[PDB]
Amino acid sequence: AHIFVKPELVAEIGVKQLQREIVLPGLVWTNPLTDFGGSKNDTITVRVPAITTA
Amino acid sequence: AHIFVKPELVAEIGVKQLQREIVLPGLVWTNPLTDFGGSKNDTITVRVPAITTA
């Protein structure tokens, strides 16, 4: 019968891929040490001080 | 590959040997008697008063 030339319409309506919310980085101790370049094996050794007894 | 001569770097970050909190000294009767020098045998006598019966 009648022929109509139509486009294929693409729409975005706010449907996204559900994906986790990030909380862990803010709670962990990040970068107390920075100069890993300049220490052998990329290892910085932390010194824990001493305690005596009377 | 390339090889480099680096120092071992020792750093303090705030890691400490965990020790408890001192609470007992503030809770015990301390120094009601002081002049232990000036008394025989480094001893001060404490007198507890008399109690009578009828």
Side-chain angles (χ1 to χ4, degrees), chain A residues 29 32-33 35 38-40 44-51, chain B residues 4-17 19:
Chain A
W29 201 8
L33 294 174
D35 207 25
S39 187
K40 293 187 286 185
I44 298 187
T45 174
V46 173
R47 167 176 45 227
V48 193
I51 67 177
Chain B
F4 304 88
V5 170
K6 294 183 183 180
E8 293 293 328
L9 285 183
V10 179
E12 295 262 25
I13 59 169
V15 167
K16 293 187 286 184
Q17 311 196 36
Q19 287 166 295

Coordinates of all heavy atoms in Angstrom, one line a residue, chain A residues 29 32-33 35 38-40 44-51, chain B residues 4-17 19:
Chain A
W29 N 44.0 4.3 55.4 CA 45.1 5.2 55.5 C 45.9 5.2 54.1 O 46.6 4.2 53.8 CB 46.0 4.7 56.6 CG 47.0 5.7 57.1 CD1 47.0 7.0 56.8 CD2 48.0 5.4 58.0 NE1 48.0 7.6 57.5 CE2 48.7 6.6 58.3 CE3 48.5 4.3 58.7 CZ2 49.8 6.8 59.1 CZ3 49.6 4.4 59.5 CH2 50.2 5.6 59.7
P32 N 50.8 7.4 53.8 CA 51.7 7.8 54.8 C 53.2 7.8 54.3 O 54.0 8.4 54.9 CB 51.5 6.9 55.9 CG 50.9 5.7 55.3 CD 50.1 6.1 54.2
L33 N 53.4 7.1 53.2 CA 54.8 7.0 52.6 C 54.7 7.3 51.1 O 53.7 6.9 50.4 CB 55.3 5.6 52.8 CG 55.6 5.1 54.2 CD1 56.0 3.7 54.3 CD2 56.7 6.0 54.8
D35 N 58.0 8.2 49.1 CA 59.3 8.1 48.4 C 59.7 6.6 48.1 O 60.7 6.1 48.6 CB 60.4 8.8 49.2 CG 61.5 9.3 48.3 OD1 61.3 9.5 47.1 OD2 62.6 9.5 48.8
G38 N 63.7 5.6 45.1 CA 64.7 5.9 46.1 C 64.8 5.0 47.3 O 65.5 5.4 48.2
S39 N 64.1 3.9 47.3 CA 64.3 2.9 48.3 C 64.3 1.5 47.6 O 63.5 1.3 46.7 CB 63.2 2.9 49.3 OG 63.5 2.0 50.4
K40 N 65.3 0.7 48.0 CA 65.5 -0.6 47.3 C 64.2 -1.5 47.3 O 63.5 -1.6 48.3 CB 66.6 -1.4 47.9 CG 68.0 -0.8 47.7 CD 69.1 -1.7 48.1 CE 69.2 -1.8 49.6 NZ 70.4 -2.7 50.0
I44 N 59.8 0.9 51.5 CA 60.2 1.8 52.6 C 59.9 1.0 53.9 O 58.8 0.5 54.1 CB 59.4 3.1 52.5 CG1 59.7 3.8 51.2 CG2 59.7 4.0 53.7 CD1 59.0 5.2 51.2
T45 N 60.9 1.0 54.7 CA 60.8 0.3 56.0 C 60.4 1.3 57.1 O 61.0 2.3 57.3 CB 62.1 -0.4 56.4 OG1 62.1 -0.9 57.7 CG2 63.3 0.5 56.2
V46 N 59.3 1.0 57.7 CA 58.7 1.8 58.8 C 59.4 1.3 60.1 O 59.4 0.1 60.4 CB 57.2 1.7 58.9 CG1 56.7 2.4 60.1 CG2 56.6 2.3 57.6
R47 N 59.9 2.3 60.9 CA 60.4 2.0 62.2 C 59.4 2.1 63.3 O 58.8 3.2 63.4 CB 61.6 2.9 62.5 CG 62.1 2.9 63.9 CD 63.3 3.7 64.1 NE 63.2 5.0 63.4 CZ 64.1 5.5 62.6 NH1 65.3 4.9 62.4 NH2 63.9 6.7 62.0
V48 N 59.1 1.1 64.0 CA 58.3 1.1 65.2 C 59.2 1.3 66.4 O 60.1 0.5 66.6 CB 57.4 -0.2 65.3 CG1 56.4 0.0 66.4 CG2 56.9 -0.6 64.0
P49 N 59.0 2.4 67.2 CA 59.9 2.7 68.2 C 60.0 1.7 69.4 O 59.2 0.7 69.3 CB 59.4 4.1 68.8 CG 58.6 4.6 67.6 CD 58.0 3.5 67.0
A50 N 60.8 1.9 70.3 CA 61.1 1.0 71.4 C 60.4 1.4 72.7 O 60.0 2.6 72.9 CB 62.6 0.9 71.7
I51 N 60.1 0.4 73.5 CA 59.6 0.6 74.9 C 60.4 -0.2 75.9 O 60.9 -1.3 75.5 CB 58.1 0.2 75.0 CG1 57.9 -1.3 74.8 CG2 57.3 0.9 73.9 CD1 56.5 -1.7 75.0
Chain B
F4 N 70.1 -0.4 39.5 CA 70.3 0.9 40.2 C 70.7 0.6 41.7 O 70.3 -0.5 42.2 CB 69.1 1.8 40.2 CG 68.6 2.1 38.8 CD1 67.7 1.2 38.2 CD2 69.0 3.2 38.2 CE1 67.2 1.5 36.9 CE2 68.5 3.5 36.9 CZ 67.7 2.7 36.3
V5 N 71.4 1.5 42.3 CA 71.8 1.4 43.7 C 71.1 2.4 44.5 O 71.3 3.7 44.3 CB 73.4 1.6 43.8 CG1 73.8 1.7 45.2 CG2 74.1 0.4 43.2
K6 N 70.2 2.0 45.3 CA 69.3 2.8 46.1 C 69.5 2.6 47.5 O 70.0 1.5 48.0 CB 67.8 2.5 45.7 CG 67.4 2.8 44.3 CD 65.9 2.5 44.2 CE 65.4 2.7 42.8 NZ 64.0 2.3 42.7
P7 N 69.1 3.6 48.4 CA 69.2 3.4 49.8 C 68.0 2.8 50.4 O 66.9 3.0 49.9 CB 69.4 4.8 50.4 CG 68.7 5.6 49.4 CD 68.9 5.0 48.0
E8 N 68.1 2.0 51.5 CA 67.0 1.7 52.3 C 66.6 2.9 53.1 O 67.4 3.5 53.8 CB 67.3 0.5 53.3 CG 67.5 -0.8 52.6 CD 66.3 -1.3 52.0 OE1 65.2 -1.1 52.5 OE2 66.4 -2.1 50.9
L9 N 65.3 3.3 53.0 CA 64.8 4.4 53.6 C 63.9 4.0 54.8 O 62.9 3.3 54.6 CB 63.9 5.2 52.6 CG 64.7 6.1 51.6 CD1 63.7 6.8 50.7 CD2 65.7 7.0 52.2
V10 N 64.3 4.5 56.0 CA 63.5 4.2 57.2 C 62.7 5.4 57.5 O 63.2 6.6 57.7 CB 64.5 3.9 58.4 CG1 63.7 3.6 59.6 CG2 65.3 2.7 58.0
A11 N 61.4 5.2 57.7 CA 60.5 6.3 58.0 C 59.6 6.0 59.2 O 59.2 4.9 59.4 CB 59.6 6.7 56.7
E12 N 59.2 7.1 59.9 CA 58.3 7.0 61.0 C 56.9 7.6 60.5 O 56.9 8.7 60.0 CB 58.7 7.8 62.2 CG 60.0 7.3 62.8 CD 59.7 6.5 64.1 OE1 58.6 5.9 64.1 OE2 60.5 6.4 65.0
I13 N 55.9 6.8 60.6 CA 54.6 7.1 60.1 C 53.5 7.2 61.2 O 52.4 7.6 61.0 CB 54.0 6.2 59.0 CG1 54.0 4.7 59.6 CG2 55.0 6.2 57.8 CD1 53.2 3.8 58.7
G14 N 53.9 6.9 62.4 CA 52.9 6.9 63.5 C 52.5 5.6 64.0 O 51.5 5.5 64.7
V15 N 53.1 4.5 63.5 CA 52.8 3.2 64.0 C 53.6 3.0 65.3 O 54.8 3.2 65.3 CB 53.2 2.1 63.0 CG1 53.2 0.7 63.6 CG2 52.2 2.1 61.8
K16 N 52.9 2.6 66.4 CA 53.6 2.5 67.7 C 53.2 1.2 68.3 O 52.1 0.6 68.0 CB 53.1 3.6 68.6 CG 53.6 5.0 68.2 CD 53.3 6.0 69.3 CE 51.8 6.3 69.3 NZ 51.4 7.4 70.2
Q17 N 54.0 0.7 69.2 CA 53.6 -0.4 70.0 C 52.5 0.0 71.0 O 52.6 1.0 71.7 CB 54.8 -0.9 70.8 CG 56.1 -1.1 69.9 CD 57.1 -2.0 70.6 OE1 56.8 -2.9 71.3 NE2 58.4 -1.6 70.3
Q19 N 50.3 0.5 73.9 CA 50.3 0.4 75.4 C 49.0 0.9 76.0 O 48.4 1.7 75.4 CB 51.5 1.2 75.9 CG 52.9 0.5 75.7 CD 54.0 1.5 75.9 OE1 54.1 2.5 75.2 NE2 54.8 1.2 76.9

